[PDB]
Amino acid sequence: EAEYTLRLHHFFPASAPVHQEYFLPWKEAIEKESDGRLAVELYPSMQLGGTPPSLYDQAKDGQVDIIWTVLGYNSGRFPRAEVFDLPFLPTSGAATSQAAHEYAMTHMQDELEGVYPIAVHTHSPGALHTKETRIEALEDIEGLKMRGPSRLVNRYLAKLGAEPIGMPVAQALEALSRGVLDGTVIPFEAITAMGLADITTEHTIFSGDRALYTTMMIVAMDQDKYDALPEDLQPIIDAHAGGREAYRIGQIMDQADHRQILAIQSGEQPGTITRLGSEETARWQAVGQEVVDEWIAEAEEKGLDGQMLYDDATRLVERYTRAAALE
Ligand SMILES: O=C(O)/C=C/c1ccc(O)cc1
Ligand SMILES: [Mg+2]
Numbered sequence: 001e002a003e004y005t006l007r008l009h010h011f012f013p014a015s016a017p018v019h020q021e022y023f024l025p026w027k028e029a030i031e032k033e034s035d036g037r038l039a040v041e042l043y044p045s046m047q048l049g050g051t052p053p054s055l056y057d058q059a060k061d062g063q064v065d066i067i068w069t070v071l072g073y074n075s076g077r078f079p080r081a082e083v084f085d086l087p088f089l090p091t092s093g094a095a096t097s098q099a100a101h102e103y104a105m106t107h108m109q110d111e112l113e114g115v116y117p118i119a120v121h122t123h124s125p126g127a128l129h130t131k132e133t134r135i136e137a138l139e140d141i142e143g144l145k146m147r148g149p150s151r152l153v154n155r156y157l158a159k160l161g162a163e164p165i166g167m168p169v170a171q172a173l174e175a176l177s178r179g180v181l182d183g184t185v186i187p188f189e190a191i192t193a194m195g196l197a198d199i200t201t202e203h204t205i206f207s208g209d210r211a212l213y214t215t216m217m218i219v220a221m222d223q224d225k226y227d228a229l230p231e232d233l234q235p236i237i238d239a240h241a242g243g244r245e246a247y248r249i250g251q252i253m254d255q256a257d258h259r260q261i262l263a264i265q266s267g268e269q270p271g272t273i274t275r276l277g278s279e280e281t282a283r284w285q286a287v288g289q290e291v292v293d294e295w296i297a298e299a300e301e302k303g304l305d306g307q308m309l310y311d312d313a314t315r316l317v318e319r320y321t322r323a324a325a326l327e
């Protein structure tokens with residue numbers, strides 16, 4: 001007998017790994033452990049309307065109860081979150097997600113006012129995907145129309161010599177199939193989610209212990225709806241919220257990346273994965289150093305301690321990466 005119904009709204013199809021492997025089990029756990037007093041209704045593919053960038057305010061303003069979105073979809077809104085967009089900062093989705101949740105609980109209390117964070121996380125390693133151009137070197141990206149999540153990933157694409165076109169990943173299949181874009185950055189599991197394997201058939205990955213980029217994402221509940229739940233239902237949410245949920249989402253993405261990458265490397269799925277060796281990779285890292293330098297200067301101008309935020313994000317990534325490897 002449902003006492004409260006929580007509407008969860010996001011930008012991806014129901015068939016996406018995070019919907020199948022996280023949102024469906026989350027709904028099952030919340031419905032079972034509340035004895036039916038909490039119903040969870042899942043609305044994928046922007047089914048309740050508006051645009052992916054509107055999602056954060058859809059939860060905050062109580063248009064819906066829970067959202068899943070990219071913080072970078074609102075330029076300038078989450079300045080401290082932006083540090084997790086910087087080039088070659090992240091490792092796995094799981095360890096980087098755990099780093100982001102800890103960072104947000106330490107540094108982003110004002111930035112996230114008005115949502116109850118079920119999970120502050122990242123996506124798994126970002127990679128390059130094109131329709132025609134095989135990227136074997138930095139020069140190959142010159143003038144390609146490419147898309148990233150956020151102003152700081154788009155800045156890096158422009159500094160690499162691409163022509164970035166800002167849009168949510170939910171619109172990338174439209175843009176690539178209609179000739180608006182040549183390619184997109186995203187993790188491989190996002191290729192699976194958006195049905196892009198037979199469209200972007202050219203993929204480029206990097207050498208070494210860091211991924212090209214990631215972006216901070218959030219499963220956000222309206223603080224007003226959480227506060228409205230009875231004192232015996234708030235704790236059921238709490239049992240399914242926090243750093244463990246961030247870790248789990250990343251780990252789901254890492255596993256879905258492995259499935260997609262293995263399928264292309266084996267020829268089960270058409271496509272080519274090009275790997276750039278250490279000397280070529282170093283050239284992309286050198287351009288990435290200019291984005292980090294510029295970001296720390298801009299942070300200082302905005303009254304943020306840029307270096308301390310970057311020292312904390314990088315240390316938490318290395319801490320949880322080391323922890324994972326030790327297990
Ligand atoms: O780049 C974006 O706009 C969004 C990226 C994204 C990557 C993996 C997901 O599972 C969901 C969103
Ligand atoms: Mg609210």
Ligand SMILES: [Mg+2]
Nearest residue numbers: 131198199201
């Ligand atoms: Mg083709």
